[PDB]
Amino acid sequence: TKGILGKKVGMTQIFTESGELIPVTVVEATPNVVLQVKTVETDGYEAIQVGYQDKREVLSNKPAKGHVAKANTAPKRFIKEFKNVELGEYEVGKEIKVDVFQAGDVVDVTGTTKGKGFQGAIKRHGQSRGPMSHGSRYHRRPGSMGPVAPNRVFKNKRLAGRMGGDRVTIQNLEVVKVDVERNVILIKGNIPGAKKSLITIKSAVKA
């Protein structure tokens, strides 16, 4: 497998070797850097730790500089691990350019969703509003909590709370174009996240 991680920019609207539009999301992938390589004999599993976005040193800290110093790079902001990849191909200090991907390949995209805040059950779970006339006093509410006999409410009864902030994949997307000069990927379709938010791109698990 493979992958990178990058920053969401925004949406566009693109023509692909024909007049057929493709809506597109822009991911800026300033070249990721390997920092650590984990193996079974020391760490329990094969994996590779990666950093994306350079901090200022005043924002970083000593024990992070010490972790970056092996690869001989600058303090990174977002740090993540990639699993189920070849370790003989990758080394500490290696820079992962966007050239790794080929326009057209199928891809999976993780991101943290836009915070919607403390929301009701209707918006949070698609529940239906009660009637708004005919004497109804039941408009935006989640309904009964359950039967009588348990004398208790069953779990996963869906209610109001924080909507958003969750980690979400989108599978079976497609890479539309690459710009290594600009370090940009164009991905067919919407993806989870606010702008200036982290995204992880990976080769598809299903494909």
Partner 1 sequence: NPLIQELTQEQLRTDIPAFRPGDTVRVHAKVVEGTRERIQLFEGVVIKRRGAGISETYTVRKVSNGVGVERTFPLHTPRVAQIEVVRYGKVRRAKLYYLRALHGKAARIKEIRR
Partner 2 sequence: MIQQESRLRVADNSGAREILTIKVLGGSGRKTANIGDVIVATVKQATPGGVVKKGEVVKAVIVRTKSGARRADGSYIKFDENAAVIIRDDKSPRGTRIFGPVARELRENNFMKIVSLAPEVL
Partner RNA sequence: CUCGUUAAGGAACUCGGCAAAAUGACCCCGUAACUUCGGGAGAAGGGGUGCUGACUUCGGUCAGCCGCAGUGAAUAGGCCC
Partner RNA sequence: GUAGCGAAAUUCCUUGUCGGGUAAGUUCCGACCCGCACGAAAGGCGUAACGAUUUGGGCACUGUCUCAACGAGAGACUCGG
Partner RNA sequence: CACCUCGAUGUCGGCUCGUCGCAUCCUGGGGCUGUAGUCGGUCCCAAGGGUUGGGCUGUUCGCCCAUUAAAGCGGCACGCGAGCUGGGUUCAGAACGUCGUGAGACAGUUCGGUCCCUAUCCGUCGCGGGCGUUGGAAAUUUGAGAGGAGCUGUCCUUAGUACGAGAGGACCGGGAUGGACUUACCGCUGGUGUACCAGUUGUUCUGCCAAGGGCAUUGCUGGGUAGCUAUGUAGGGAAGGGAUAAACGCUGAAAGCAUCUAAGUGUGAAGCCCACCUCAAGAUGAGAUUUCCCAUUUCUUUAAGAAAGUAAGACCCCUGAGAGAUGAUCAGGUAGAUAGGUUGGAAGUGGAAGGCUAGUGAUAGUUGGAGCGGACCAAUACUAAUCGGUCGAGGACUUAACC
Q: Enumerate binding residues for partner 1 (CB under 8 A).
A: 9-10, 12-15, 18-19, 21, 26, 28, 179, 182, 184, 186
Query: Dihedral of CA 90/93/94/98: which sign?
Result: positive
Q: How far is the CB of 184 from partner 1 (least distance, A)?
A: 7
Q: Establish if 195 lies at the interface with RNA (CB under 7 A).
A: yes
Q: For the window 63-82, what string marks contact with RNA as x by the rule CB under 7 A?
A: xxxxx---------x-xxx-
Residues 6 or more apart whose Cβ sits within 8 Å of residue 16 = 22, 176
Q: What is the spatial distance between Cα 59 and Cα 207, in angstroms, rounded to a whole number? A: 40
Q: Which does 184 bind (CB under 5 to 8 A by kind): partner 2, RNA, partner 1, none?
A: partner 1
- Which amino acid would we find at residue 98? V
Q: Which of residues 20-49 bind partner 2 (CB under 8 A)?
A: 20-21
Euclidean distance between CA atoms 28 and 187, whole angstroms: 11
Of these partners, RNA, partner 2, partner 1, none, which one is at the site of residue 175 (CB under 5 to 8 Å by kind)? none
Cβ proximity to RNA, 3 vs 99, nearer residue? 3
Give the binding range for partner 2 (CB under 8 A) out of 4-12, 19-27, 92-100, 186-194. 19-27
Burial of 173 (0-12, 13-18, 19+ CB in 10 A): buried
What does the alpha-carbon distance between residue 74 and residue 35 come to, in Å, rounded to a whole number?
11
Interaction partner, residue 67 (RNA, partner 1, partner 2, none; CB < 5-8 Å by kind): RNA
Pairing of strands 3-15, 198-203: antiparallel
Residue 113 and residue 166 in contact, taking contact as beta carbons nearer than 8 Å: yes
Structure tokens given for 103? 């326009």
Segment contacting partner 2 (CB under 8 A): 15-23, 65-73, 134-142, 170-178?
15-23
Q: Which residues lie closer than 8 Å to 126 by C-beta, 6 or more apart?
A: none
19 contacts RNA (rule: CB under 7 A): no
> Could you tell me the smallest distance in angstroms from the CB atom of residue 95 to RNA?
18
Chain residues binding partner 2 by CB under 8 A are 13, 19-21
